């Protein structure tokens, strides 16, 4: 997180998001900086496991 | 426009979906190929008959069967869910005969093909066994070896048997996963004065083999029948005109 | 690459799991091998065709039948449970 900002430098991270969490993604990143008040990152969301697998249909689907 | 075939059958091994090397099924009696097709059928009931109106086709598989009466290792392999094993030949030094060995009694060796059979007398003085001690039944084809008789001075029981074995191919039972196999038909017609007819079949599941008469009885040569279905390959494109199971090719 | 076959049977009777002393089954007339296996299939619907697309054994046996002309007591115990 200790990172110099060169003057007129823009740093562009890569905010990677993972496959593995808790179903609720509740975060609250904090970007704290001397004589400047506290500009938090709030990154709201949620995780879902996809249902990859095709049933055999022999027999009718009933929806 | 008229058709009686004979010809020749070629089947190529699929591994994980990658085509495998064409290799001849050898002589063929029998190819057969059937097609089943399950409907619903919708019935109005206007007319006061309730007669059949229309009907969809729903279901849709087809099964072929194949009498060949090759017993080669390939076929085998094939047919029996094997993998073919190849041993080569050799000589044995070693082996250790039954103990309490009497005339009479029949010695079986673990290998087959013997030849220059040598019996070596356990002692402090090697002193191999005379030949005319023991006999050969069916020329060494099984190691089977009867003893003749014994000299009265009975010699040390155990014995130490030397001999060369030859090289043999052997098929395991169920000790393959299921083949799949795509095959190519060579039929000429001889209606239309040996007109060329191609079949292909993309994907075929094959099915074990159903009898096999060791011993037979009459004139005819052993038959051997597999049943198959053939599969819906997934790779060919589904707009394409020939299809996804097979297809026929004659030429005019 | 023909198959007419004639010869000889020989059985080992399995005690305990420890092989027996090998004998003649005397004269055999006729014997075959018969496998079974039983399958499960799996099909896909995308083309409309509701046409099996997939299937892998799940059952394997096989069974041998022997016929045998033999009265012999040793073959009648074999066959008698005697």
Excluded: C
């Excluded at chain 2, 356990?122 to 060494?140: E, H, I, K, N, W």
């Excluded at chain 2, 094959?206 to 037979?216: F, G, K, M, R, V």
């Excluded at chain 2, 599969?231 to 005019?252: A, E, M, V, Y």
């Amino acid at each position: 997180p200790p990172l110099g900002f060169a003057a007129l430098e823009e740093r562009t991270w890569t905010v990677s998001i993972g496959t593995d969490g808790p179903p609720v993604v509740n975060a609250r990143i904090v970007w704290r900086l001397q004589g400047e008040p506290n500009l938090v990152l709030v990154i709201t969301g949620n995780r879902i496991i996809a249902w990859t697998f095709a049933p055999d249909w022999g027999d009718s689907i009933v929806e | 426009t008229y058709f009686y075939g004979q010809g020749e059958i070629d089947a190529a091994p699929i591994v994980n979906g990658v085509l495998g090397k064409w290799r001849w099924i050898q002589d063929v009696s029998a190819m057969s190929i059937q097609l089943a097709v399950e409907k619903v059928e919708h019935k109005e009931s206007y007319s006061g008959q309730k007669a059949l109106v229309r009907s969809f086709p729903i279901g849709k598989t087809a099964t072929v069967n194949i009498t060949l009466h090759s017993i080669g290792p390939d076929n085998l392999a094939l047919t029996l869910y094997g993998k073919v094993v190849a041993k080569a030949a050799g000589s044995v030094t070693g082996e250790v005969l039954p103990a309490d060995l009497v005339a009479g009694d029949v010695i079986r060796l673990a290998n087959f093909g013997v030849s220059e059979l040598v019996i070596t007398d356990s002692a402090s003085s090697p002193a191999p066994l005379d030949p005319q001690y023991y006999a050969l039944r069916a020329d060494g084809a099984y190691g089977e070896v009867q003893l003749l008789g014994l000299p009265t001075p009975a010699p040390t029981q155990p014995f130490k048997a030397a001999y060369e074995y030859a090289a043999t191919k052997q098929v395991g039972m169920f000790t393959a996963p299921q083949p799949t196999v795509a095959l190519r038909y060579k039929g000429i017609n001889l209606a239309e004065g040996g007109a060329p007819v191609i079949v292909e079949l993309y994907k075929v599941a094959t099915d074990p083999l159903q009898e096999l008469a060791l011993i037979s009885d009459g004139n005819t040569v052993a038959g051997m029948q597999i049943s198959g279905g053939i599969l819906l390959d997934t790779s060919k494109p589904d707009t394409g005109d020939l299809g996804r199971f097979g297809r026929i090719i004659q030429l005019g």
